[PDB]
Short mmCIF file of C-alpha atoms and ligand atoms in Angstrom, two decimals:
data_model
loop_
_atom_site.label_atom_id
_atom_site.label_comp_id
_atom_site.label_asym_id
_atom_site.label_seq_id
_atom_site.Cartn_x
_atom_site.Cartn_y
_atom_site.Cartn_z
CA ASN A 1 126.13 69.37 190.10
CA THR A 2 122.87 69.16 190.75
CA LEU A 3 119.67 67.37 191.93
CA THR A 4 116.00 67.60 190.02
CA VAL A 5 113.38 66.84 192.46
CA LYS A 6 109.95 66.09 190.98
CA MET A 7 107.31 67.26 193.55
CA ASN A 8 103.71 66.18 193.48
CA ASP A 9 100.48 67.08 195.39
CA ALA A 10 99.66 64.42 198.27
CA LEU A 11 96.93 62.84 198.58
CA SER A 12 94.94 60.91 201.04
CA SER A 13 94.51 58.16 198.50
CA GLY A 14 97.69 58.45 197.20
CA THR A 15 99.65 60.63 194.77
CA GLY A 16 98.64 63.34 192.99
CA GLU A 17 99.30 66.12 190.70
CA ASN A 18 103.08 66.74 189.36
CA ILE A 19 103.38 70.60 190.66
CA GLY A 20 107.07 71.32 188.86
CA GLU A 21 110.04 70.55 190.36
CA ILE A 22 113.04 71.66 192.40
CA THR A 23 116.80 71.89 191.44
CA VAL A 24 119.36 71.91 194.42
CA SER A 25 122.53 73.09 193.97
CA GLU A 26 126.26 73.53 195.97
CA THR A 27 127.26 77.22 196.93
CA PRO A 28 130.32 78.35 198.69
CA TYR A 29 127.62 78.55 201.42
CA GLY A 30 125.47 75.67 201.66
CA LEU A 31 122.68 74.01 199.65
CA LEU A 32 120.38 76.12 197.22
CA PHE A 33 117.21 75.22 196.68
CA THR A 34 115.63 76.81 193.30
CA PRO A 35 111.77 76.42 193.04
CA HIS A 36 110.07 76.00 189.61
CA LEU A 37 107.00 75.48 190.71
CA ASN A 38 102.72 76.01 190.24
CA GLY A 39 99.37 75.88 191.72
CA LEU A 40 100.05 76.11 195.34
CA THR A 41 98.67 78.71 198.02
CA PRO A 42 100.24 82.31 197.89
CA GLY A 43 102.46 83.33 200.83
CA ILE A 44 105.03 80.87 202.97
CA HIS A 45 104.71 77.22 203.08
CA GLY A 46 106.79 75.28 205.43
CA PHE A 47 109.06 73.36 203.53
CA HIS A 48 111.47 71.00 204.99
CA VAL A 49 113.99 67.71 204.34
CA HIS A 50 111.65 64.60 205.96
CA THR A 51 113.55 61.46 206.69
CA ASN A 52 112.32 58.80 204.45
CA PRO A 53 112.26 58.33 200.67
CA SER A 54 108.62 57.91 200.70
CA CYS A 55 105.72 60.53 199.48
CA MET A 56 102.72 57.53 200.07
CA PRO A 57 100.07 58.17 202.57
CA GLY A 58 99.48 56.65 205.78
CA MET A 59 97.02 55.16 208.33
CA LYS A 60 97.20 57.25 211.69
CA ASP A 61 95.17 55.61 213.98
CA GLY A 62 92.36 54.84 211.33
CA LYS A 63 92.79 57.79 208.99
CA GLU A 64 94.43 58.03 206.33
CA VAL A 65 97.43 60.99 206.25
CA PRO A 66 99.22 62.01 203.25
CA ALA A 67 102.76 61.72 202.55
CA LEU A 68 103.00 60.23 205.76
CA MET A 69 105.33 57.51 205.13
CA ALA A 70 107.90 60.34 204.97
CA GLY A 71 108.46 59.84 208.46
CA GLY A 72 110.01 63.13 210.11
CA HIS A 73 112.43 65.79 210.06
CA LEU A 74 115.52 64.74 208.98
CA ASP A 75 117.02 64.90 212.60
CA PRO A 76 120.35 62.67 212.77
CA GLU A 77 121.46 64.52 216.15
CA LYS A 78 117.98 63.31 217.67
CA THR A 79 117.67 67.06 218.84
CA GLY A 80 113.97 66.70 218.79
CA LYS A 81 113.24 70.35 218.32
CA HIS A 82 112.11 72.25 215.81
CA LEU A 83 114.71 75.66 215.22
CA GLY A 84 114.80 76.34 211.22
CA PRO A 85 117.69 76.28 208.72
CA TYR A 86 119.69 78.99 210.92
CA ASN A 87 120.39 77.43 214.30
CA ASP A 88 122.41 74.50 214.72
CA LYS A 89 120.38 73.35 217.48
CA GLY A 90 117.25 72.02 215.46
CA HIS A 91 116.47 69.26 212.57
CA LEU A 92 119.03 69.55 209.99
CA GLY A 93 116.42 69.13 207.44
CA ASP A 94 114.66 72.61 208.19
CA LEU A 95 114.80 74.70 205.13
CA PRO A 96 113.95 78.56 204.89
CA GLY A 97 110.02 79.03 204.01
CA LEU A 98 109.17 78.15 200.61
CA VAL A 99 108.07 81.57 199.16
CA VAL A 100 105.01 80.99 196.88
CA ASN A 101 103.92 84.17 194.74
CA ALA A 102 100.67 85.83 194.44
CA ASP A 103 100.00 83.69 191.45
CA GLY A 104 100.52 80.73 192.57
CA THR A 105 104.09 79.79 191.34
CA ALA A 106 107.28 79.51 193.34
CA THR A 107 110.51 80.57 191.89
CA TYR A 108 112.29 82.88 194.84
CA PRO A 109 115.48 80.78 195.80
CA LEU A 110 115.98 79.05 199.32
CA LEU A 111 119.29 78.83 200.92
CA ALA A 112 120.01 76.30 203.79
CA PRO A 113 123.39 77.05 204.86
CA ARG A 114 123.54 74.36 207.20
CA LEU A 115 123.18 71.48 204.52
CA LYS A 116 126.85 71.69 202.69
CA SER A 117 126.32 68.85 200.08
CA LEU A 118 124.41 66.96 197.34
CA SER A 119 125.04 63.46 199.34
CA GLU A 120 122.94 64.41 202.65
CA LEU A 121 119.79 64.53 201.06
CA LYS A 122 119.89 60.91 199.27
CA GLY A 123 117.03 58.50 200.67
CA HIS A 124 115.20 61.37 202.26
CA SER A 125 112.36 63.61 200.64
CA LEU A 126 111.20 67.30 200.14
CA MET A 127 108.00 68.52 201.70
CA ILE A 128 105.90 71.52 201.50
CA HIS A 129 103.23 71.61 203.75
CA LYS A 130 100.06 73.65 204.18
CA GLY A 131 100.96 75.75 206.39
CA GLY A 132 103.94 78.55 207.45
CA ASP A 133 107.20 78.26 209.30
CA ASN A 134 107.86 79.81 212.59
CA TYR A 135 111.18 77.86 212.81
CA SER A 136 109.98 77.30 216.05
CA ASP A 137 107.49 74.68 218.47
CA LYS A 138 105.67 77.37 219.82
CA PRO A 139 102.59 78.57 219.76
CA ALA A 140 102.28 75.78 217.07
CA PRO A 141 104.88 72.30 216.98
CA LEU A 142 106.92 71.82 214.36
CA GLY A 143 106.84 75.35 213.13
CA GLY A 144 102.97 75.63 212.30
CA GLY A 145 102.96 74.11 209.08
CA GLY A 146 100.27 71.35 209.40
CA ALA A 147 99.05 68.90 206.56
CA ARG A 148 101.64 67.70 203.81
CA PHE A 149 100.62 69.10 200.52
CA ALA A 150 103.38 68.12 198.28
CA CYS A 151 106.34 65.84 198.50
CA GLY A 152 109.37 64.41 196.34
CA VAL A 153 111.47 61.37 197.13
CA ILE A 154 115.36 62.09 196.18
CA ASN B 1 124.81 92.37 217.33
CA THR B 2 121.73 94.33 215.92
CA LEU B 3 121.32 97.54 213.16
CA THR B 4 118.64 99.62 212.33
CA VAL B 5 117.77 101.04 209.13
CA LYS B 6 114.57 103.46 208.14
CA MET B 7 113.47 102.82 204.86
CA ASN B 8 111.61 106.27 202.46
CA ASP B 9 109.91 106.03 199.23
CA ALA B 10 112.04 108.03 197.05
CA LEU B 11 111.12 110.32 194.86
CA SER B 12 112.61 112.66 191.82
CA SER B 13 111.90 115.70 193.99
CA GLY B 14 113.57 113.98 197.05
CA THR B 15 112.72 112.00 200.02
CA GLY B 16 109.54 110.39 200.45
CA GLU B 17 107.39 108.79 202.98
CA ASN B 18 108.80 106.42 205.52
CA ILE B 19 107.69 102.85 205.15
CA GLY B 20 109.23 101.12 207.80
CA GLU B 21 112.56 99.46 208.93
CA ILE B 22 115.15 97.09 207.99
CA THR B 23 116.84 95.49 211.26
CA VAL B 24 120.23 93.73 210.33
CA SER B 25 121.58 91.03 212.94
CA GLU B 26 124.94 88.96 212.78
CA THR B 27 124.27 85.09 213.12
CA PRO B 28 126.48 82.38 212.45
CA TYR B 29 126.21 81.86 208.89
CA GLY B 30 125.68 86.00 207.79
CA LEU B 31 123.54 89.21 208.10
CA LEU B 32 120.65 88.63 208.49
CA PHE B 33 117.94 91.17 207.06
CA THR B 34 114.61 91.04 209.27
CA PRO B 35 112.47 93.95 207.25
CA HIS B 36 109.52 95.05 209.21
CA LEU B 37 108.06 97.36 206.06
CA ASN B 38 104.94 98.07 204.39
CA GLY B 39 103.53 100.17 200.92
CA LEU B 40 105.49 97.98 198.48
CA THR B 41 104.18 96.25 195.41
CA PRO B 42 103.36 92.24 196.13
CA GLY B 43 105.97 90.13 195.04
CA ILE B 44 109.67 90.06 194.99
CA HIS B 45 111.98 93.04 194.89
CA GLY B 46 115.79 93.78 194.06
CA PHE B 47 117.54 94.47 196.98
CA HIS B 48 120.70 95.52 197.31
CA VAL B 49 123.28 97.44 199.14
CA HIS B 50 124.51 100.64 197.00
CA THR B 51 128.27 102.47 197.38
CA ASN B 52 127.02 106.12 198.48
CA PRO B 53 125.81 106.65 202.03
CA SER B 54 123.15 108.83 199.97
CA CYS B 55 119.53 108.37 198.44
CA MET B 56 119.12 111.84 197.17
CA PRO B 57 118.24 112.37 193.43
CA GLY B 58 120.06 112.55 190.43
CA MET B 59 119.79 113.16 187.40
CA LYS B 60 120.61 110.66 183.89
CA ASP B 61 120.01 112.06 180.22
CA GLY B 62 117.24 114.70 180.72
CA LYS B 63 115.28 113.22 183.82
CA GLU B 64 115.24 112.99 188.01
CA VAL B 65 116.41 109.69 188.77
CA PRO B 66 115.19 108.71 192.38
CA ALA B 67 117.49 107.93 194.53
CA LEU B 68 120.72 108.29 191.56
CA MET B 69 123.06 109.79 194.32
CA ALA B 70 123.42 106.31 196.01
CA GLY B 71 125.82 105.09 193.36
CA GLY B 72 125.92 101.72 191.82
CA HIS B 73 125.74 98.40 193.86
CA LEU B 74 128.56 97.80 196.44
CA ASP B 75 130.86 96.47 194.37
CA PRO B 76 134.78 96.63 196.44
CA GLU B 77 136.40 93.95 193.93
CA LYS B 78 135.25 95.86 190.66
CA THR B 79 133.75 92.67 189.28
CA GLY B 80 131.28 94.79 187.30
CA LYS B 81 129.34 91.42 187.70
CA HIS B 82 125.92 90.97 189.31
CA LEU B 83 125.86 87.38 190.41
CA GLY B 84 123.45 87.88 193.68
CA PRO B 85 124.08 86.64 197.45
CA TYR B 86 125.43 83.25 196.95
CA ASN B 87 127.88 83.82 194.30
CA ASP B 88 131.48 85.00 195.33
CA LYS B 89 132.32 86.58 192.14
CA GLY B 90 129.57 89.83 191.82
CA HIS B 91 128.55 92.81 193.68
CA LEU B 92 129.64 92.43 197.38
CA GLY B 93 126.33 94.58 197.51
CA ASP B 94 123.84 91.67 196.51
CA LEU B 95 121.35 90.39 198.81
CA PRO B 96 118.78 87.90 198.58
CA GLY B 97 115.38 89.51 196.76
CA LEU B 98 113.20 91.16 199.28
CA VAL B 99 109.81 89.43 199.57
CA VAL B 100 106.40 91.71 199.58
CA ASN B 101 103.71 89.46 200.68
CA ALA B 102 99.64 90.65 199.79
CA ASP B 103 99.06 92.95 201.61
CA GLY B 104 102.06 95.42 200.93
CA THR B 105 103.97 94.36 203.94
CA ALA B 106 107.37 92.98 204.08
CA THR B 107 108.42 90.41 206.52
CA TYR B 108 110.16 87.35 205.08
CA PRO B 109 113.48 87.95 206.91
CA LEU B 110 116.62 87.38 204.31
CA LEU B 111 120.18 86.09 205.22
CA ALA B 112 123.29 87.52 203.26
CA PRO B 113 125.95 84.76 203.49
CA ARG B 114 128.62 86.93 201.90
CA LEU B 115 128.69 89.69 204.97
CA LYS B 116 129.78 88.91 208.33
CA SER B 117 129.56 91.99 209.99
CA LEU B 118 127.73 95.05 210.45
CA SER B 119 130.59 97.37 210.03
CA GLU B 120 130.72 96.35 206.15
CA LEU B 121 127.25 98.26 205.86
CA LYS B 122 128.53 101.49 207.73
CA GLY B 123 128.92 104.65 204.96
CA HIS B 124 126.23 102.68 202.66
CA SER B 125 122.84 102.61 201.92
CA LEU B 126 120.33 99.73 201.32
CA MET B 127 118.17 100.13 198.01
CA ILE B 128 114.49 98.48 197.31
CA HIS B 129 114.03 98.32 193.58
CA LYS B 130 110.57 98.62 191.74
CA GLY B 131 111.26 95.08 189.83
CA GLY B 132 112.44 91.91 190.82
CA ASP B 133 115.97 89.88 191.05
CA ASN B 134 117.67 87.16 189.26
CA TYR B 135 121.12 87.70 190.32
CA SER B 136 121.90 87.84 186.75
CA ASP B 137 122.70 90.54 183.73
CA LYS B 138 120.96 88.68 181.33
CA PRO B 139 117.89 89.12 179.85
CA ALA B 140 118.07 92.57 181.93
CA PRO B 141 121.20 94.03 184.01
CA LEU B 142 121.74 94.15 187.65
CA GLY B 143 118.94 91.45 187.58
CA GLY B 144 116.13 93.37 186.69
CA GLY B 145 115.63 95.65 189.45
CA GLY B 146 115.28 99.14 187.48
CA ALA B 147 114.19 102.05 189.02
CA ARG B 148 114.79 102.55 192.82
CA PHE B 149 111.57 102.62 194.66
CA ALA B 150 112.86 103.05 198.40
CA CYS B 151 116.18 103.76 200.33
CA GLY B 152 117.84 104.26 203.83
CA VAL B 153 121.47 105.23 204.33
CA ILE B 154 123.72 103.83 207.35
CA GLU B 155 126.83 106.04 209.22
CU1 CU C 1 107.85 69.31 206.74
CU1 CU C 2 120.17 98.37 194.22
ZN1 ZN C 3 111.97 70.37 211.80
ZN1 ZN C 4 124.45 93.67 191.61
#
């Protein structure tokens, strides 16, 4: 049982290059996200599930913002707080930071214990930000992920 | 709720330099291993709990092998299979691969959902191998961790 999520670079002018795909599976402890991607800045990237089934860019006060139409972080309990994949009090869509190797690839598997079923990701999207994620709204909001680099509807 | 384990480079002649410590904490989802290490090769390293409370070098077939006395991967139900930290059918000691940044540091926290109490780690050891870990015995046995680079013992 799997979900193959294709990921594409998000541009302010639209959808860019494909950079691989992410395969999600169920384990006795939660959903496992096993990436197979390339062309990413080495390091740890914010990685979250967003509300809307779209990666389309959008205008914000007159400026085009990449993958803006994705909406915010999946948060069916309107917590309104970014606390990470290990805190039952924040965004349910908060996944562990994506690990990007030194050669630009991402292969390290990520476990999101709070997510249990493949039906929970239906009608949403997976996002990879430019920045990292400190699993909090301080000092920088939303973990400090900043701009949206790549996105997948799934 | 916390546990600290000092890690030391493993050499054939004995215990080497200290490279920091790993703090283990209990969470509603299992044991969390938060490393504070340095002096590792960038990338992903095999990271597992080993049976024996020892990091001393041993010898096997003509050579001195670093931290050999630590024994094998903690496997209570003698599965004999290295399936990773999310598979109940393998080594209970199988932790997620250790993430080492580009500057040789290790800080990325690792969650091992299969362990729920600090007590389960008592009388064992934590191991950091030279190679990675694909959570399988194929193509290479034991996720391909290979040689033992650093080790720490525990109560
Ligand atoms: Cu996000
Ligand atoms: Cu090992
Ligand atoms: Zn969030
Ligand atoms: Zn193992």
